[PDB]
Amino acid sequence: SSVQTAATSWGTVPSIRVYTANNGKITERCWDGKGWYTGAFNEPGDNVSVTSWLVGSAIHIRVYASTGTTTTEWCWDGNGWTKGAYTATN
Template structure:
């Protein structure tokens, strides 16, 4: 089992935390946005890493999930609902 996490403060100074945990087959997102913990998205995979940054549009997240030796980038961006597959290509 593996875990990675990220956090940020929004414009109203509220803390947001994301934790991504694997049971060896599925990555599960857990979210804390000030009202306790909720379960977010799930992704097929055994390993994950995450980064986040903010710009004038808002908060961006990139989640890199490895499944069967292939890494896929998932993107969460302001103005785009949910997660989308990114452009990362594994060499």
Template sequence: MSDNPNYPIGTAAVSWLDSSNQIHIRVYSTDGYTLTERCWDGGGWVAGGFNAPGGAVSATSWQASDGVHIRVYATNDDATIEWCFDPGSDWTQGQYTTS
């Protein structure tokens, strides 16, 4: 149906606990063209600030002494692009390149 929204065809998720044991979840979904982020920080699901082109998605995260680091890998136009979120910064394109 033309009036239906674009439904996700691929999903990746990351999670971590903060210092007060609050769980945080990030879900990255693609409709085949665009990746979007949904966030859970204990108060319900909200739209996140990440949005990028991509037909496939994977993600990883880790917690370091400075906070949580997130990497999202989006496949688009026969290449994989790395997107990075690090403490104190906004989303930036990473250095990963497809061989």
């Protein structure tokens, strides 16, 4: 019923991404230094966590979206979100 969030950031400006799980849907809000805006991430789930890392200037983000006991990893590597190889046996 109530929302759950996860957050990551990179750089010095910085860039910030905030993921919100709300009523079974996870969405993304973005800051790149001047105004919040809506990101491309849209995936189902009731729970979210996130981590990210830089390779030089290139950001890589991994979002772990869970529904029930099933966790799906979503990957940003500069050119769209794709499903990752993560599995777990919950």
